[PDB]
Write a protein that binds this DNA or RNA. Structure first.
Ligand SMILES: Nc1c(C(=O)NCc2ccc(F)cc2F)c(=O)n(O)c2ncc(CCCCCO)cc12
Ligand SMILES: Nc1c(C(=O)NCc2ccc(F)cc2F)c(=O)n(O)c2ncc(CCCCCO)cc12
Ligand SMILES: [Mg+2]
Ligand SMILES: [Mg+2]
Ligand SMILES: [Mg+2]
Ligand SMILES: [Mg+2]
Ligand SMILES: [Zn+2]
Ligand SMILES: [Zn+2]
Lengths: 367, 183, 367, 183
DNA sequence: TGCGAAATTCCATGACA
DNA sequence: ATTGTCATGGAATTTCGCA
DNA sequence: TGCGAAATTCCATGACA
DNA sequence: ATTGTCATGGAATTTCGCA
C-alpha cells in the first residue's frame, strides 16, 4: 500500500520508471507496458506469487518468470525468482548440473617398480573350474600385471593372492577402490604388519583406479579373442594372458611392461636382443635412464563452462545408488579443504568429514 | 662370449620330504644363475606333475633359456621334456652322482637348506606360511662377490624390505636340544 | 631363396636399398641396419612370421611390428602386418572403433498437431495401486503429452490407452521404438484399421525416439520433486504432472505445449491473456503464424575424426546384448543403401536386410 | 464484450440409464460452448463421485472457467462445489424445469442423443467400444452457422478423419421394427 | 549518442533403461 | 524401411531508462 | 638441396560394472 | 584423507634412399 500509494498520485519511486502511467482498476494498481496491462502487486504479496508460479511445475528461472509476466510486473522480477530457486529444496536436490568438472589431473608416474600397486577385481565371470572373479594387480611404474582367479571378491581371497605375490617384493603403497574386500579391517591389519600403506580412491570414481581399470579392459579383450567359437573356459588362459600382456609393447612408450621391470626380455618369442653385449650393470644403468625419460601426458584444456572448488563453497554430493523417483543429489554441504583442483573434503550431510571427487559434486545454484 | 644375464639359466631342485604343512611335503627350489634370485614352490610330491604345475606359475612371469637340474626322475621324464620343448626351453643335466651348478648357486642352495632348518625347529608343521618371508630374506641378502643383492640385480632398484639384521643362520644350542629330540 | 640369392652376390632388387651390405650367417640372410643386425626371411616365411607375432596378444599395427622388428627386417613390413590385421577375424569383431559417427540430424518439426505421435514406456516403477509402468504419448509438433498408467508394457494396455486418446483425434503417424508392445502384429492390425502409419526407430537407438525420451526425463524429474519426503505414490500424481508439463513454458520457444495445440490458455494459474480482444478466427490465424516460425536447430559440426557411410563399404553392426567375454561386434557386412547420412541398410550377418543407425556401426578396419 | 473463446464454458449433462455395456450405464456429455467440441465419459451412476472421476480426466487436459448444468443432484452437491472451487471453476445452473444452454449446444446435445440411438439398435450392449468413433464423428461434423467443424475451431487445423459421408441420423424403417421390439 | 543496469538471448551441460 | 531432444543457469549480448 | 615413398609420430576415440 | 588410462588405426609429420 504505502509504496504503491505514492505511485498512483505521481511521485517517483526508485525502480519504477517514470514514463509509464500507473493507474488503479478493480482495486488493484496496474501499469500500461509495451506487452500490455500488468498488475503491480504490493511488496508483501510478491514472494507468494513467485512461489505459486514456481510450484506449478518446479520450473527454472525463465520458465517461472514467463508465467508471472502474463499477469504481473514489478521492478527486478528475476531477482525475486532467483531468490526462491535458491530456497527450493526439491529443485536443488533433483535438478542436474550444467557446469562441467575441471580438467583431469595426470598424476606423476611412480618412480620405481613396487612403489605403488593398483588392485581391483574383475567379475562375476562365467563359472570356470568353480572360479568367478579375477584379482588384477598392476604395478604403477611398469604396468606389469599379476592375475589371480578367486571364487569371491573377498578379503580372504585377496590376502591369499597377495601373500603369493609379495614373495617377490613388498610394495610401498597399495591403491584400491572402496570395495568391501579392501576396506575391511582384516585387510588393513594385513597391510600394517608388512609396512604397506593403503591408499583408497574417492568413493564411486573408478577413474582414480584408472591404471588397473584400463588393464582390465586389455585382459577382457584378449580373453574374448582367445575364446571366440569356444566355451568360455578362461581359468586355464589367465597365465597365457598374463604373460602375453606383460610382454606387449606400448606404442607410445616403445617398451613392454616386462622390459620396464627387468630391463631384458626372457625366453619369449621375438625377444629383443639390443643389449646382448652390455654387462648387466651397464644394462641396469640404461634401464634407469629409460624409466626416468618415459612419456608423460599433461592436463588437457578445460571445457568452456567448468567449475573449480573454492573453500567455503556450497556443493552437493551425488547420491550413490539412488532409488526410483528419488533425488540424484544430497543436500548442500560446504567445502572444507581443497586437496587438489579435482579432490576436496566436505562437511557431509550427516555431519562427517568426507573426501570426494569433483566429478561427484555439483556447485549449488543461486548461491 | 656374451655377458651373463638373468633368465639365461634357472637351476631347479627338490628339497624334502619335510613334515606336512597344510598337506605339502616338498619344496621346488628355482634359482636364477646370474642374479641368484630364488623362487620357492611347495609341492605334494617330487613328480613331473607337481613340477609342471609349479613351473607353469613361474613361466607365466618369465621363461628361462635353459633349465639345469640333476638326473632326478621328475626332470628326466619325457613329459617334462615335451613341456620344455613346447616353451623353447633347453634342458641341461649334470652327470649322475656329480651335481655341478655354480659357486653362486651352490652357496645359495646351501643358504636355503640351513635357513629352512633354522625356522623348521620349534614350528615344524608351519613352514608353508613362512615361504614368502624366506624368499624375501634370500633375495635381499648381500652378495660377497657382487656388490648387490639378487633383488637389485633383477629389478635394478633398492628394495622396500632390506634385511640389514643379518641373522646368524647357525643353530643355537637350545635349538640343538629340540632338534635332537624329534628327527 | 631365388630373390635372396641375387641379393647376397650384390645385385640390386627393388625394395632392398643398396647402401647396406647383405651377408650370410648361420645359414640365414642378414643385413646391418642402424638399429642392429636383422634377419631377412624369405618371402614364403613372412606371412607366418607376421602371424606368430600378432597372435601373441592379438596386437595392432605398431605393437605387432615392434615385435617383428626385434629379429627381422624386410621391405614394407607394415603392409604385411596390415594385411594380416584385416584377415584376423577375432580382432575385427572384438576391437573397439576409433572413428566417431557423423553429426546428428535434426529432423524437421512436424508441421501440424497430430501429424506424428511419439510413444514409449517408462518403467518399471515402484508399485502404486498395482500399476508399474506409464505410457507416454508426445505430439511431435506441440510437445503436448498424454500419460497413462499400466500394469505391463503390453500391446493390450497400449491399445486400451490409445483408444481413449484417439477419441480426441487420430494421428497420421505413430513413432515408437522396437519394443515388444509396438512391434506385435496385434498393434499393426490396430493401426491399419484406423489409417495410422506405424514408424519404427532403428534398433537399439533411443536417440531416434528423442522427443518422447526427453519428455520422460521431465516427467520423472517432476514426480521426484513432488514425492520428496513421501512414499512414492505416483499414480495419483500423473494427472497433475500431465497438466503441469503441458502448461510449462519452453524458454527457447516462448510457448507452452498447450498454447501450441490450442492457441489459448485454459483456466490455469497465470493464464496468458494477450489475445483477449481477438476473435477466435483472428486467434487461429496468429496460431498458424506462430507454429511455422518456431525455432529449429541445425546439424552441429562434425568431430575431427568422423566417418560417413558409402554404398558397398564393409561395416560391422554392434552386438545388442553381448554375453560376458564375447565379442562386441558382428562379422563384416556390406552397405546396400544410404537412407541418410546417419541411417543405412545393410546385408545382415544372417543374410537379411537390416536398417540400422550409424551409431551402432563401425567401419571395418584395414579395408 | 470480449469475444467467445474455447474453455470459457463447458456444458455438462448425463444421458441414461442405458443397457449395460461392460458394466457402464450412463454417459457424461461435456460440450465446449464456443467450438461445440464434445467429450464423452461412461459412468456407472449419475453421482457426484462418477462425475468427479470423469471430469478429473478432462481437467488434466484443460480447465474451463465456467461449468454449466441443470439442477441435477450430482451437480448441486457440496462435494461438487468444493471440487469446482479447488480448481477455480465457477458453477452455473439453469432454472429448474427450464433447461437453457445455447442454440449451438442444444443442437449438439440433440445430435448426440440421436446418434447414440441409431447405433444402439442392433448392438445395444456394445456402445462402450463405440464412444471413440462417436466423438470423432461429432467433432468432425460441419457446422451450418460457422464455417468450420469443432475440431477445426479447437486446434486450428484440418483433421485426419473427415466425415464427408454425412450419415442420415434418422432411423430406417427396419430399425424401427427392431427398436419397437425391445424398449 | 552515450552510459550503467536490467532484460534478453546464448549455449554448454547432462539425462531420458 | 529412416533421422536426438530440451530444461537449466551463468555468461554474453541487447535493450531500456535517462540524459 | 630437393623429390616420392616409407617410416614414424600424432591423437581422437572409446571402454575399463 | 587424494589424483584417469592407453591400445587403436587413419592422418599428419618426419625421415629415408637416391640424386
Ligand atoms: N563401478 C565400479 C567400477 C566401474 O564402474 N568401472 C567402470 C569404469 C567407469 C569409468 C571409468 F573411468 C573407469 C571404469 F573402470 C569398477 O571398475 N570397479 O572396480 C568397481 N569396484 C567396486 C564397486 C562397487 C562400489 C565400491 C565403492 C566405490 O566407491 C564398483 C565398481
Ligand atoms: N534402452 C532403452 C531405452 C534407453 O536406453 N533410454 C535411455 C536413453 C539413452 C540414450 C538416449 F539418447 C536417449 C535415451 F532415452 C529407452 O529409452 N527405451 O524406451 C527402451 N525401450 C525398449 C528397450 C528394449 C529394446 C527394444 C528394441 C530396441 O531396438 C530399451 C529401451
Ligand atoms: Mg572395483
Ligand atoms: Mg574396476
Ligand atoms: Mg522404449
Ligand atoms: Mg525410453
Ligand atoms: Zn522447486
Ligand atoms: Zn588378432
Amino acid at each position: 500500500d504505502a509504496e504503491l500509494d505514492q505511485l498512483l498520485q505521481g511521485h517517483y519511486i526508485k525502480g519504477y520508471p517514470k514514463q509509464y502511467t500507473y493507474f488503479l482498476e478493480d482495486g488493484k494498481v496496474k501499469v500500461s507496458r509495451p506487452e500490455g496491462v500488468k498488475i503491480i502487486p504490493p511488496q508483501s504479496d510478491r514472494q507468494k506469487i513467485v512461489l505459486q508460479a514456481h510450484n506449478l511445475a518446479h520450473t527454472g528461472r525463465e520458465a517461472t518468470l514467463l508465467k508471472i509476466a502474463n499477469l504481473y510486473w514489478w521492478p527486478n522480477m528475476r531477482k525475486d525468482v532467483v531468490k526462491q530457486l535458491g530456497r527450493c529444496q526439491q529443485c536443488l536436490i533433483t535438478n542436474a548440473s550444467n557446469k562441467a568438472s575441471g580438467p583431469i589431473l595426470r598424476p606423476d608416474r611412480p618412480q620405481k617398480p613396487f612403489d605403488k600397486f593398483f588392485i581391483d577385481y574383475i567379475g562375476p565371470l562365467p563359472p570356470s573350474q568353480g572360479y568367478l572373479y579375477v584379482l588384477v594387480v598392476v604395478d604403477g611404474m611398469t604396468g606389469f600385471t599379476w592375475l589371480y582367479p578367486t571364487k569371491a571378491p573377498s578379503t580372504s581371497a585377496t590376502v591369499k593372492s597377495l601373500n603369493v605375490l609379495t614373495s617377490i617384493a613388498i610394495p610401498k603403497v597399495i591403491h584400491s577402490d572402496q570395495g568391501a574386500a579392501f576396506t575391511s579391517s582384516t585387510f588393513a591389519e594385513w597391510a600394517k604388519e608388512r609396512g604397506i600403506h593403503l591408499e583408497f580412491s574417492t568413493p564411486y570414481h573408478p577413474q582414480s583406479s584408472g591404471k588397473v581399470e584400463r588393464k582390465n579392459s586389455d585382459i577382457k579383450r584378449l580373453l574374448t579373442k582367445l575364446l571366440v567359437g569356444r566355451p568360455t573356459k578362461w581359468y586355464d588362459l589367465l597365465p597365457v594372458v598374463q604373460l602375453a600382456l606383460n610382454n606387449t609393447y606400448s606404442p607410445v612408450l616403445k617398451y613392454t611392461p616386462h622390459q620396464l621391470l627387468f630391463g631384458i626380455d626372457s625366453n619369449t618369442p621375438f625377444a629383443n636382443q639390443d643389449t646382448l653385449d652390455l654387462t648387466r650393470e651397464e644394462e641396469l644403468s640404461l634401464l634407469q635412464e629409460i624409466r626416468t625419460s618415459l612419456y608423460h601426458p599433461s592436463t588437457p584444456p578445460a571445457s568452456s563452462r567448468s567449475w573449480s572448488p573454492v573453500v567455503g563453497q556450497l556443493v552437493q554430493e551425488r547420491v550413490a545408488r539412488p532409488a526410483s523417483l528419488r533425488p540424484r543429489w544430497h543436500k548442500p554441504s560446504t567445502v572444507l579443504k581443497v586437496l587438489n583442483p579435482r579432490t576436496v573434503v566436505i562437511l557431509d550431510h550427516l555431519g562427517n568429514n568426507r573426501t570426494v571427487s569433483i566429478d561427484n559434486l555439483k556447485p549449488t545454484s543461486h548461491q | 662370449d656374451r655377458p651373463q644375464k638373468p633368465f639365461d639359466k634357472f637351476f631347479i631342485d627338490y628339497i624334502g620330504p619335510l613334515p606336512p604343512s597344510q598337506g605339502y611335503l616338498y619344496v621346488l627350489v628355482v634359482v636364477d644363475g646370474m642374479t641368484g634370485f630364488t623362487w620357492l614352490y611347495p609341492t605334494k610330491a617330487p613328480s613331473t606333475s607337481a613340477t609342471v604345475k609349479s613351473l607353469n606359475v613361474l613361466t607365466s612371469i618369465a621363461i628361462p633359456k635353459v633349465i639345469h637340474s640333476d638326473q632326478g626322475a621328475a626332470f628326466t621324464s619325457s613329459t617334462f621334456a615335451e613341456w620344455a620343448k613346447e616353451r623353447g626351453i633347453h634342458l641341461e643335466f649334470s652327470t649322475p652322482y656329480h651335481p655341478q651348478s655354480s659357486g653362486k648357486v651352490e652357496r645359495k642352495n646351501s643358504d636355503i637348506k640351513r635357513l629352512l632348518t633354522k625356522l623348521l625347529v620349534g614350528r615344524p608343521t608351519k613352514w608353508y606360511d613362512l615361504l614368502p618371508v624366506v624368499q624375501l630374506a634370500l633375495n635381499n641378502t648381500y652378495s660377497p662377490v657382487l656388490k648387490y643383492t639378487p633383488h637389485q640385480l633383477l629389478f635394478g632398484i633398492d628394495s622396500n624390505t632390506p634385511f640389514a639384521n643379518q641373522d646368524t643362520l647357525d643353530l643355537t644350542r637350545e635349538e640343538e636340544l629340540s632338534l635332537l629330540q624329534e628327527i
